[PDB]
CSV table of C-alpha atoms and ligand atoms in Angstrom, one decimal:
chain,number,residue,atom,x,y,z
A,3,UNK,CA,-25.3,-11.1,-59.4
A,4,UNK,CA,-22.0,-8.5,-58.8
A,5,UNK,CA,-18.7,-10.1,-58.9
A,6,UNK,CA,-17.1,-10.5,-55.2
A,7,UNK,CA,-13.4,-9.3,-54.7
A,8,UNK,CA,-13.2,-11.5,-51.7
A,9,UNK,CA,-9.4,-9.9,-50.8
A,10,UNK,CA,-11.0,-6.2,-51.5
A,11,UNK,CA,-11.8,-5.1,-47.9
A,12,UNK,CA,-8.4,-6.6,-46.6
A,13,UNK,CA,-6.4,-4.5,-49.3
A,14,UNK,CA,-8.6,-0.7,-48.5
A,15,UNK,CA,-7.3,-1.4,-45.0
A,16,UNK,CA,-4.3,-2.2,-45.6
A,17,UNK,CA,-3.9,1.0,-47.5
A,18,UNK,CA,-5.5,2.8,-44.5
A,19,UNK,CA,-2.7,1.8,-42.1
A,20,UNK,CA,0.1,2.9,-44.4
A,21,UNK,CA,-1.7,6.3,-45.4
A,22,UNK,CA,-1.7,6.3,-41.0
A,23,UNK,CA,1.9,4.9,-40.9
A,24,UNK,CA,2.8,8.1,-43.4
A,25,UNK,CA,0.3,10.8,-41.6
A,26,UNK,CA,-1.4,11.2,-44.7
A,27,UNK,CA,-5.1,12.7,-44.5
A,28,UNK,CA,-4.8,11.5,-40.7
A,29,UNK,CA,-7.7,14.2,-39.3
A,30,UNK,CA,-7.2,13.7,-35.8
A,31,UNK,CA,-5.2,13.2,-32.8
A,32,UNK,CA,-6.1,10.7,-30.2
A,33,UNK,CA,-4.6,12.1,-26.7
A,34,UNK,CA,-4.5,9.4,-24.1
A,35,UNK,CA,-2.4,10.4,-20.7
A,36,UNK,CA,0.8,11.6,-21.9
A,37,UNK,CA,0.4,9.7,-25.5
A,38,UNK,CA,-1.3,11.0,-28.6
A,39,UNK,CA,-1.8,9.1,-31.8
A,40,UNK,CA,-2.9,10.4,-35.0
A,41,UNK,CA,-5.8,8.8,-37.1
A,42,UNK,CA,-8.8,9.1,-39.6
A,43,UNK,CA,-12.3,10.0,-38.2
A,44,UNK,CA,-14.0,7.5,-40.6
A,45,UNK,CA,-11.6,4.9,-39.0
A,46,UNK,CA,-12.2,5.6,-35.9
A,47,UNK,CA,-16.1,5.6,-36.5
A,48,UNK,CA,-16.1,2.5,-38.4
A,49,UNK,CA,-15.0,0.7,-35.5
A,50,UNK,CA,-15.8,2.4,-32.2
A,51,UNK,CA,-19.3,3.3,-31.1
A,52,UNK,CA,-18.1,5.8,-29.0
A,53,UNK,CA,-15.8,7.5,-31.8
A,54,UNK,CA,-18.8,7.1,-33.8
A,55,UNK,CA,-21.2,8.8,-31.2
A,56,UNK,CA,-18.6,11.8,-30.7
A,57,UNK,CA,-18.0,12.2,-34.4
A,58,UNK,CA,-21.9,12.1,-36.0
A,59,UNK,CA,-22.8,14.6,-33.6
A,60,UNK,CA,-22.1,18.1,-35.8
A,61,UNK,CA,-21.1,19.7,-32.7
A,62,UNK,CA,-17.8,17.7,-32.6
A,63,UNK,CA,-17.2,16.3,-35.7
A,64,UNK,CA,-14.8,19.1,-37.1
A,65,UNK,CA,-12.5,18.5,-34.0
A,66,UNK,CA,-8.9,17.8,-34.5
A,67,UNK,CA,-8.0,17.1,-30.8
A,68,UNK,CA,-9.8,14.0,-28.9
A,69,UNK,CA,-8.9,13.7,-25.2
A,70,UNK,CA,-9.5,10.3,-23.8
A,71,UNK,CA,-10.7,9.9,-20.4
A,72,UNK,CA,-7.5,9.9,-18.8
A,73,UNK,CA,-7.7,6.3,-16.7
A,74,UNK,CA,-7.2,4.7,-20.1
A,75,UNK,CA,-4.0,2.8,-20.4
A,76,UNK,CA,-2.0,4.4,-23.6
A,77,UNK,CA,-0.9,0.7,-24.9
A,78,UNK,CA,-4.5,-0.5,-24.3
A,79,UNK,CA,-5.2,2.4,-26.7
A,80,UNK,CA,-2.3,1.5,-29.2
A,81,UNK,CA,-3.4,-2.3,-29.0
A,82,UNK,CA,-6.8,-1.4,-30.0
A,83,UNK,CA,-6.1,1.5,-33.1
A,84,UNK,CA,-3.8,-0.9,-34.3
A,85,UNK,CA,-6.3,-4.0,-34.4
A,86,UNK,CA,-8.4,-1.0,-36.1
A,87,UNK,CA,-6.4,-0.9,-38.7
A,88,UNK,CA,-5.3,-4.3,-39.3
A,89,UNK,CA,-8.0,-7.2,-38.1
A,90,UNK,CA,-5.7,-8.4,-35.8
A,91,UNK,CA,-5.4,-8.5,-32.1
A,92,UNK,CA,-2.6,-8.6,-29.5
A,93,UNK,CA,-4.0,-9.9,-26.6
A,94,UNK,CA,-2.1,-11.5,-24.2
A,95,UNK,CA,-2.0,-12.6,-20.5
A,96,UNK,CA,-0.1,-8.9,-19.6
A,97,UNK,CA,-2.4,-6.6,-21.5
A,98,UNK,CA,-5.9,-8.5,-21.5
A,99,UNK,CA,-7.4,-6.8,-18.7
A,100,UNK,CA,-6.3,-2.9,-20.1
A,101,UNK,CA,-7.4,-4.1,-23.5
A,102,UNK,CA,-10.7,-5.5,-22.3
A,103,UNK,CA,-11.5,-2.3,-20.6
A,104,UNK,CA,-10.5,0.4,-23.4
A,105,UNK,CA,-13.0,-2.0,-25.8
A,106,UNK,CA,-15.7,-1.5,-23.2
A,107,UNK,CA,-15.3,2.3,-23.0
A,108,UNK,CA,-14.5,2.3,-27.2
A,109,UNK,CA,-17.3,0.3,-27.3
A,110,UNK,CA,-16.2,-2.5,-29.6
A,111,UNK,CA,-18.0,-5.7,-28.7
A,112,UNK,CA,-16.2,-8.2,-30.0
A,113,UNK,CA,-13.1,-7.4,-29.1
A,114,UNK,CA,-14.9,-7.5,-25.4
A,115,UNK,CA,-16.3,-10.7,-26.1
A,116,UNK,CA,-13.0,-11.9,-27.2
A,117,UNK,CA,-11.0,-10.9,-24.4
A,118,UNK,CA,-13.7,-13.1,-22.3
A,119,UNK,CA,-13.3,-15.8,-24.7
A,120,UNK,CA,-9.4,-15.1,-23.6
A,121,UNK,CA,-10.4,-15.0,-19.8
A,122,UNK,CA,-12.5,-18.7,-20.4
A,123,UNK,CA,-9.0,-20.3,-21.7
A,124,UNK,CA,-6.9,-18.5,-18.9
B,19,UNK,CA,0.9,-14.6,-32.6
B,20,UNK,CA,-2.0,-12.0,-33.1
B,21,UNK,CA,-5.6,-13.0,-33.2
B,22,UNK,CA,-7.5,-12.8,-36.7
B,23,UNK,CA,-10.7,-10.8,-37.4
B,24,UNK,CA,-11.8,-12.5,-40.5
B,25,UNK,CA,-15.0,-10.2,-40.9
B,26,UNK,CA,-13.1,-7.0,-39.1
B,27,UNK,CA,-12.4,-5.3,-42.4
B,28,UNK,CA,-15.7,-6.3,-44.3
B,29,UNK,CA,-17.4,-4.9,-41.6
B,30,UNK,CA,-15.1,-1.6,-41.8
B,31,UNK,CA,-15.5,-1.2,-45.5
B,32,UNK,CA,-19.4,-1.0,-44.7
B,33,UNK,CA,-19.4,0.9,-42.4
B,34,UNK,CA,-17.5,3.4,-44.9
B,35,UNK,CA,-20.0,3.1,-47.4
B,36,UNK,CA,-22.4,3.8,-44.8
B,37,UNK,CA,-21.3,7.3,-43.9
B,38,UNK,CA,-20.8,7.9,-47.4
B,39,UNK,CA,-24.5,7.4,-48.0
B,40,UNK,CA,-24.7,9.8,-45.5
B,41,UNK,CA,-22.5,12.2,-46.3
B,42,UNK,CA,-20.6,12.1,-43.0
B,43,UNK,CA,-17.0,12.8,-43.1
B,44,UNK,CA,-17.0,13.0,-46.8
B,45,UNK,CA,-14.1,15.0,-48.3
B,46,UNK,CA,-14.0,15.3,-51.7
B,47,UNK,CA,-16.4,15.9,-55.0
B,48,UNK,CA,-15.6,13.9,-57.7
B,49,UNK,CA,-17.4,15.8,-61.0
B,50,UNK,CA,-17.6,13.0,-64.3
B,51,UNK,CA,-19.4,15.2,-66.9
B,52,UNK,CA,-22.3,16.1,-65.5
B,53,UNK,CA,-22.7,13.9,-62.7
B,54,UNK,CA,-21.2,14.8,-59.4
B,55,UNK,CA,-20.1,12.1,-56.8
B,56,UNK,CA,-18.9,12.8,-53.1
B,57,UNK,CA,-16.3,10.1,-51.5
B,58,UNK,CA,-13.6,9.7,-48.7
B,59,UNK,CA,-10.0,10.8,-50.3
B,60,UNK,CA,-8.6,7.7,-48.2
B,61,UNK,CA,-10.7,5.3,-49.7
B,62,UNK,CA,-10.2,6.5,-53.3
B,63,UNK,CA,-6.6,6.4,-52.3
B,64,UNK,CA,-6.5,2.6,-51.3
B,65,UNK,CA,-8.3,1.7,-54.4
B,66,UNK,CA,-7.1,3.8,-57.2
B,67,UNK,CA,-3.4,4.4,-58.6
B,68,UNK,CA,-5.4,7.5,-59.7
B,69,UNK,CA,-6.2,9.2,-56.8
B,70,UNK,CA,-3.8,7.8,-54.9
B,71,UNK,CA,-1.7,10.0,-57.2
B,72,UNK,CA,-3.2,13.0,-56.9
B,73,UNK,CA,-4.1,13.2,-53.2
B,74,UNK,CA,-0.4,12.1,-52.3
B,75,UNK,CA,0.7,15.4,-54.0
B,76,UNK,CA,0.6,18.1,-51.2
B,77,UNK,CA,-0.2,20.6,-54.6
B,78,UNK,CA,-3.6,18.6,-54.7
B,79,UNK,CA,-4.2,17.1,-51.6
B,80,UNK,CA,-6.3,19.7,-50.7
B,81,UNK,CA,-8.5,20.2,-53.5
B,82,UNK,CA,-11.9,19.7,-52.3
B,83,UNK,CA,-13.6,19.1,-56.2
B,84,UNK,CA,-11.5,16.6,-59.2
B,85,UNK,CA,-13.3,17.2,-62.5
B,86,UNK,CA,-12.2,13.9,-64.4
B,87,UNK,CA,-12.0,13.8,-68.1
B,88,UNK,CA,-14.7,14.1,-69.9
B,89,UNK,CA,-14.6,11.1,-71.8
B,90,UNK,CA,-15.2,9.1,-68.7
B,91,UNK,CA,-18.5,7.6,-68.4
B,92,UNK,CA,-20.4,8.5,-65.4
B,93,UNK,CA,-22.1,5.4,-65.2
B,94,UNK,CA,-18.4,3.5,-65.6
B,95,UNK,CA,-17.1,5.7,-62.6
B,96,UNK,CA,-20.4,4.9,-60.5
B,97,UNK,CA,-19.9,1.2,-61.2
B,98,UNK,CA,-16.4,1.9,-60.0
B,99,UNK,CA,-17.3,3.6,-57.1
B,100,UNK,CA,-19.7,1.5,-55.7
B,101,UNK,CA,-17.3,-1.4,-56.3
B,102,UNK,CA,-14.5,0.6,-54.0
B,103,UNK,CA,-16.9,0.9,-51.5
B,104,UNK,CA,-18.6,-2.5,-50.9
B,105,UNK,CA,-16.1,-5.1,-53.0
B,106,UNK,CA,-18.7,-5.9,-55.4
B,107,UNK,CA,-18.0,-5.7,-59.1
B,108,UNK,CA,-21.8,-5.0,-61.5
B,109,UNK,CA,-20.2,-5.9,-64.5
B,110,UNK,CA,-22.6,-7.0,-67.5
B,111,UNK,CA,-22.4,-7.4,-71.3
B,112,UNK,CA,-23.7,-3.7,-71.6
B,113,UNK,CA,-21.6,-2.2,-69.6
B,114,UNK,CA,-17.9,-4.4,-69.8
B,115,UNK,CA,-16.2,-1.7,-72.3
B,116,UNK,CA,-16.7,1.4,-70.2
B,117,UNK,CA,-16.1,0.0,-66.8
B,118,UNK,CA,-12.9,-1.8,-68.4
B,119,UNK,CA,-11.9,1.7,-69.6
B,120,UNK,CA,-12.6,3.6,-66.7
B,121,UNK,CA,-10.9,0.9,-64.8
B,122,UNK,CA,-7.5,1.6,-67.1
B,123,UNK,CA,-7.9,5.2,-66.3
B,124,UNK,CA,-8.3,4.5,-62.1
B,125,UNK,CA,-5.4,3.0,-62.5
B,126,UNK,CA,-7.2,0.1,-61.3
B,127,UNK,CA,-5.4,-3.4,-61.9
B,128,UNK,CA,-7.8,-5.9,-60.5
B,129,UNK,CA,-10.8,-4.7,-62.2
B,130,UNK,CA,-9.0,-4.4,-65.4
B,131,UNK,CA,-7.7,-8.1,-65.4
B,132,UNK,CA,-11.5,-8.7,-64.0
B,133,UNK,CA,-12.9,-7.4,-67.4
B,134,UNK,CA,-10.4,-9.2,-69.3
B,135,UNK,CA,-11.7,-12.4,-68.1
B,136,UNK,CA,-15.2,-11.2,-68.5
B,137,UNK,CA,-14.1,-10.5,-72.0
B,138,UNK,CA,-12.1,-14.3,-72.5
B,139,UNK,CA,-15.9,-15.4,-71.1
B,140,UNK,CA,-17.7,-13.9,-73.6
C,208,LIG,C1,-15.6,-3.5,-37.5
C,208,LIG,C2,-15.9,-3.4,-36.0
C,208,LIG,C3,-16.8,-2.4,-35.6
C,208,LIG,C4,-17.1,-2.2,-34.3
C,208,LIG,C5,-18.0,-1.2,-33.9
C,208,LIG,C6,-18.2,0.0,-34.6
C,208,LIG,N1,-19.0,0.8,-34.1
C,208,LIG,C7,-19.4,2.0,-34.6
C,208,LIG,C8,-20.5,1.9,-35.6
C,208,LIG,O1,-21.3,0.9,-35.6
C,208,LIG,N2,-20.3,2.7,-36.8
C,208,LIG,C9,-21.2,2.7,-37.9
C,208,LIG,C10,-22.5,2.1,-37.8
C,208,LIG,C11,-23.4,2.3,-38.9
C,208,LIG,N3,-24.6,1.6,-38.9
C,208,LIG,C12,-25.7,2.2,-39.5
C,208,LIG,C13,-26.7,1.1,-40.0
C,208,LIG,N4,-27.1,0.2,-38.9
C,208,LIG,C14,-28.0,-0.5,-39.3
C,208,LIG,C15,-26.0,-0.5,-38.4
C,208,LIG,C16,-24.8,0.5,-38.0
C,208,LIG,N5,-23.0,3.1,-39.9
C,208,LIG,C17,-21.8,3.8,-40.0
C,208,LIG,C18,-20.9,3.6,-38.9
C,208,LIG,CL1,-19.3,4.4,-39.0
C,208,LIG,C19,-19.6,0.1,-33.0
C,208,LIG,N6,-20.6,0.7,-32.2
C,208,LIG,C20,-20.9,-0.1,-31.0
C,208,LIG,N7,-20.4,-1.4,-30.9
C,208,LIG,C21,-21.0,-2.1,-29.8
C,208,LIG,C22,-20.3,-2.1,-28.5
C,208,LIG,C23,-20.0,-2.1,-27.4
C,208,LIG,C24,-19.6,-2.2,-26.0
C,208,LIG,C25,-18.8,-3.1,-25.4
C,208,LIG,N8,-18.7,-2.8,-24.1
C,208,LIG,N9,-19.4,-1.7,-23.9
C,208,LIG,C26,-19.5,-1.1,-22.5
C,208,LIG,C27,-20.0,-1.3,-25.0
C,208,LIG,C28,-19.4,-1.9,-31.7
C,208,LIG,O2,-18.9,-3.0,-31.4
C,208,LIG,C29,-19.0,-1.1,-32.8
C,208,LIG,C30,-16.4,-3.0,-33.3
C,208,LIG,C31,-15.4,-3.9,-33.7
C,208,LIG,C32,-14.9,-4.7,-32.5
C,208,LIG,N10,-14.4,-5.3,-31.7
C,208,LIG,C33,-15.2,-4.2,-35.0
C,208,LIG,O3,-14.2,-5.1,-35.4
C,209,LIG,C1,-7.9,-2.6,-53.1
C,209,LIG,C2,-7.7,-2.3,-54.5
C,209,LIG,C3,-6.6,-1.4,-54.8
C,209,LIG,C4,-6.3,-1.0,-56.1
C,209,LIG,C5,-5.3,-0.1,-56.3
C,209,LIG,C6,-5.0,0.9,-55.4
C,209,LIG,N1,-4.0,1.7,-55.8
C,209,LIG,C7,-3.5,2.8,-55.1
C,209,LIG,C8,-2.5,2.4,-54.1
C,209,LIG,O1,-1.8,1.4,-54.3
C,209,LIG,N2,-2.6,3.0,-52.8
C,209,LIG,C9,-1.7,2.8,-51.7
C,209,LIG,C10,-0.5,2.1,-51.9
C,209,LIG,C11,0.4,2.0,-50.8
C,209,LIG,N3,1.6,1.2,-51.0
C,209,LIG,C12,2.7,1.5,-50.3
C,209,LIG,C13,3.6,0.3,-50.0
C,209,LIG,N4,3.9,-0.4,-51.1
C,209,LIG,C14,4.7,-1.3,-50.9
C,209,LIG,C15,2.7,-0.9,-51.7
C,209,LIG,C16,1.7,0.2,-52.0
C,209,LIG,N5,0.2,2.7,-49.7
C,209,LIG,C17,-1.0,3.5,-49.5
C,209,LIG,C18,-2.0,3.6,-50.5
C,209,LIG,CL1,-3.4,4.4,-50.3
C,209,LIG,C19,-3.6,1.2,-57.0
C,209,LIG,N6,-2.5,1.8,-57.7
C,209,LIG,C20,-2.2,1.2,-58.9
C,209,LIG,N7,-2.9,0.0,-59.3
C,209,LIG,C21,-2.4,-0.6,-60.5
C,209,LIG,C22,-3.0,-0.3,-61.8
C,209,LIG,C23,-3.3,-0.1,-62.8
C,209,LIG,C24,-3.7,0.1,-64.3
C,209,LIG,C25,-4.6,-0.6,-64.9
C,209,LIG,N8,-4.7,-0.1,-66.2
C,209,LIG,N9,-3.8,1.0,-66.3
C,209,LIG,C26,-3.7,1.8,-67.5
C,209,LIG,C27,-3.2,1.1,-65.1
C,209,LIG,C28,-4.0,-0.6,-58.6
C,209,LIG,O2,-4.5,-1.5,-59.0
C,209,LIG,C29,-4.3,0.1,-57.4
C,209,LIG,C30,-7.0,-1.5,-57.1
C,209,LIG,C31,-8.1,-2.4,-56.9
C,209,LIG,C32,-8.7,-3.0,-58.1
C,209,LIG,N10,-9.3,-3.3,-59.1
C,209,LIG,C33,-8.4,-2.9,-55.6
C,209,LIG,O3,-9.5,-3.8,-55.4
């Protein structure tokens, strides 16, 4: 019977991306070949099962470096934090395959399924 | 040109709430009285001119405990609180004045105009 703020969710994240635009309460960097990128954990975990699975374990939770497996392409990377942040998704014919294989290894799903959706219409 | 998400940050906001109900990642204490809550600083950033206040202050960003004023009514900031974390507003005939005045003290526009309809309603 609660009252739905239907434009709610859109603004928090919003507000995430420009606390991560100014650094601010950004917990961890994201090193990926010779890129880093600096985010929240609970970002990170909200979207990605395998920044999920690294962060709930208490063993790594309290890190402040993450190394990426280093055969991940950097703007794969970038094209994925940043549809983390914002809902949207630059996929195009250049980057689909690099972005479809940083969403397997994030494990994000429907950005994997989309990219196939992508491959069915190209 | 980007592709839209339209569930991407529903499903984020969730899966915040989520690890708060688990205490994972959590940053802060936020003390009402006698009540104690425990919350993200982002997300109380995003959604209160309040916080977003304080925590942008590098004097305060650290603080790991906020002790509000002790007018506030617990129950008003819970309502609140929940209502950051999932977009849902439980607003009701016994409870319209203090979550309106908690919402002025947030520094929490929405909510505030919310009640003011509620109010214009009834
Ligand atoms: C909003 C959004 C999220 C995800 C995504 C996030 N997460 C981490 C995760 O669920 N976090 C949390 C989960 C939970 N509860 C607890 C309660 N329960 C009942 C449900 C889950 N509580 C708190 C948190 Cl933080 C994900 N984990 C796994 N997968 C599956 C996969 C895969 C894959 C693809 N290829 N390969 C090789 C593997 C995910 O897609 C996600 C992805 C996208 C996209 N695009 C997206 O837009
Ligand atoms: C999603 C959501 C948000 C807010 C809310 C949040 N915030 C803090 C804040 O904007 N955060 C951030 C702002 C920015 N940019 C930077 C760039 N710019 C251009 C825009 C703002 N960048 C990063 C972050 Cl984190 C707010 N601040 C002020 N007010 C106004 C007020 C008031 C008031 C009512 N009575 N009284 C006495 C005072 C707000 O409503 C909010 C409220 C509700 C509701 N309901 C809601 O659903």
């Amino acid at each position: 019977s609660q009252i739905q703020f239907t434009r709610h969710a859109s603004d928090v994240l919003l507000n995430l991306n420009r606390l991560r635009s100014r650094d601010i309460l950004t917990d961890v960097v994201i090193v990926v070949s010779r890129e880093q990128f600096r985010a929240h954990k609970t970002v990170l975990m909200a979207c990605s099962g395998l920044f999920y699975s690294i962060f709930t374990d208490q063993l790594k939770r309290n890190l402040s470096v993450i190394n990426l497996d280093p055969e991940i392409n950097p703007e794969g990377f970038n094209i994925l934090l940043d549809f983390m942040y914002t809902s949207r998704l630059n996929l195009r014919e250049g980057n689909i395959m690099a972005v479809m294989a940083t969403a397997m290894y994030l494990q994000m799903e429907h950005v994997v399924d989309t990219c196939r959706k992508f491959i069915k219409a190209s």
